[PDB]
Amino acid sequence: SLALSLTADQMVSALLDAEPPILYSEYDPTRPFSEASMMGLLTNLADRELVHMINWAKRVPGFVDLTLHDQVHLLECAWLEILMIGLVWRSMEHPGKLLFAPNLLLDRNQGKCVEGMVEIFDMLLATSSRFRMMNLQGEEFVCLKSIILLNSGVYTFKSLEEKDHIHRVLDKITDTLIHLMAKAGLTLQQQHQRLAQLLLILSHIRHMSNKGMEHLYSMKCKNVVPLSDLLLEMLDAHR
Amino acid sequence: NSLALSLTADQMVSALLDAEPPILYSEYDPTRPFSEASMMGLLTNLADRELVHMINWAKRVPGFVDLTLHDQVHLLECAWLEILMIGLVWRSMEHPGKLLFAPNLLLDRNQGKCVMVEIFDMLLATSSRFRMMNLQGEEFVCLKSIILLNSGVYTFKDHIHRVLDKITDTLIHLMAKAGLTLQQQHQRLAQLLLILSHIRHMSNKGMEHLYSMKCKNVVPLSDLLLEMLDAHR
Amino acid sequence: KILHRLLQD
Amino acid sequence: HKILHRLLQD
């Protein structure tokens, strides 16, 4: 496979080239804003982002080597994590605000329009401020996002030869993260420390996704926020 | 200033090893064919007694005593189920296909059907992964303290992150000691830390289940467990 | 599954 | 007023 034959810079090149675009929302600033309209905007945006995420996953090295059943499984458990880390990355340069779209910037005050959303908003803000303090690089972000895709579902799977292949790709991404930090002048002690700090953030992203997934499972029962057929299939994959 | 940052790597390992809590027992009259109320009763009684030792283990984690009382409460409230799970998973390494809740309480996935079969399989998968990696006890005590300090720090910091980096140095120092090359050192570091994401996932799914048993009132939960469980809303 | 079809095309 | 406070101070 070409995934195990890629160098570090070639890995970064492939990941940077496969980046999905930043989509716009249908946000009308003049129009009044109900709790159901804000969620309608967030649902519409996330549904369109999902289509791009699926084609982005195809371009992640090693992902196409997997069986079709495993690709479905990895995306079903990781899709919200990937949306959330993308949101957090876009919001680094906007302290106290979440850039859902270039025309949709929300602070924690607007997040209060949806009940229970406040806690998830604050965790996303805290993750965004952590990236800002660490000065996370774009080359490091695409590595982390691809780690989430390959790691988040590998322990939720007779012939586990495909599981061993995912770990070989994960190790190559680790080599790529280290190659980036050594390129930026960090010492060996600094490289290992930064690598650990980044991967520990993925634990909190999993936490946010789990808490977010159960907030989405309740709004489906309320039937007030519209839910697309793809998102309902993604949401039912966790229940 | 704190005392944990002056400790060398070996001093950090020994301090964590010596702080290890004991392996407690379940009730001795088994009546091994379990029901839902009986199995949940045994697990609740065991987890309640382990929590007392965990709180005393946490005080002995270098750097943990230097936090305010409110900060210590927040970290333990957010991480207590993760710490119980990585403890259970570590005990179950040498018993593939089984979960060693206690030396007199070895359960398989068939037993998990009386209540949580999906959480059983996840725990067994984590134990099998640790067994494949040949996880060492010096590595396990570092991972468990990382969970204690990391899981809640983003929900409040500079002192905690300095301590987290200290354990990172300790993990690498343990891998270079075992003869691993430089590339093998950061590869193994990444593999271990990525498993913490799944442990977090198991805790979240597990906490959901315990919230159901409270509203089901199937097994009486202790007030301490009720306070730890209620802290997750 | 919609996800399955989109991963094929 | 938490049991966790007492156990952390004992």
A31: left (phi over 0), alpha (psi -120 to 50) or beta: beta
> Of the candidates A57, A58, A72, which has its C-beta nearest C1's C-beta?
A72
Indicate the residue type of A239.
R
Q: What share of chain D is helix, strand, coil (3-state, %, to 5)?
A: 70, 0, 30
For residue A67, give the nearest of B128, B118, C4 by alpha carbon.
C4
Radius of gyration (Cα) for chain A, nearest Å?
18
Give the integer Cα–Cα distance in Å for B177 and B189: 14
Terminus-to-terminus CA distance in chain C, angstroms?
13
Terminus-to-terminus CA distance in chain B, angstroms?
35
- The answer to whether B173 is a known ligand-binding residue is no
**With contacts defined as CB-CB under 8 Å, which chain B residues touch A175?**
183, 186-187
Give the integer Cα–Cα distance in Å for A49 and A39: 15
| Distance of residue B208 Cα from the nearest chain D Cα, in angstroms | 21
**With contacts defined as CB-CB under 8 Å, which chain C residues touch A57?**
7
Task: Give the CATH fold of the B1-233 domain.
Answer: Retinoid X Receptor (1.10.565)
CB proximity B77 to D under 8 Å = yes
Residue B107 is given by DSSP the state E
| Distance of residue A205 Cα from the nearest chain B Cα, in angstroms | 9
Return the number of CB contacts < 8 Å for B and D.
26
Domain segments of chain A as ranges: 1-239
- The answer to whether B36 is a known ligand-binding residue is no
């990172």: which residue's tokens? B168
């409040």: which residue's tokens? B156
Method: X-ray
**With contacts defined as CB-CB under 8 Å, which chain D residues touch B148?**
none
Q: Cα separations (Å) of B159 from A150, A159, B179?
A: 32, 46, 31
**Inter-residue contact A111 to A32 (CB < 8 Å):** no
Terminus-to-terminus CA distance in chain A, angstroms?
35
Give the integer Cα–Cα distance in Å for A239 and A229: 15
Residue B106 host element (H or E): strand B105-107
Tell whether the torsion through CA atoms of B169, B152, A176 and B133 is positive or negative: positive
**Sequence-ordered list of residues with C-beta below 8 angstroms from that of A131, at least 6 positions apart, any chain:** A88, A89, A92, A141, A201
Interface of C with A (CB under 8 A): 1-4, 6-8
How many CA atoms, within 13 angstroms, populate the side-chain half-sphere of residue A83? 27
> Which class does domain A1-239 fall in?
mainly alpha
Tell me if residue A116 falls in helix, strand or coil: coil
**Inter-residue contact A18 to A59 (CB < 8 Å):** yes
- The answer to whether A49 is a known ligand-binding residue is yes
Instruction: Render the burial of B30-55: b for 16+ CB within 10 Å, e for the rest.
Output: eeeebeeeebbbbbbbbbeebbeebb
Neighbouring chains of A at 3+ CB pairs under 8 Å are B, C
Residue B34 is given by DSSP the state -
> Of the candidates B171, B186, B233, which has its C-beta nearest A174's C-beta?
B186
Q: Cα separations (Å) of B20 from B23, B142, B144?
A: 9, 11, 10
Give the integer Cα–Cα distance in Å for B226 and B232: 10
| Distance of residue D5 Cα from the nearest chain B Cα, in angstroms | 7
CB proximity B61 to D under 8 Å = no
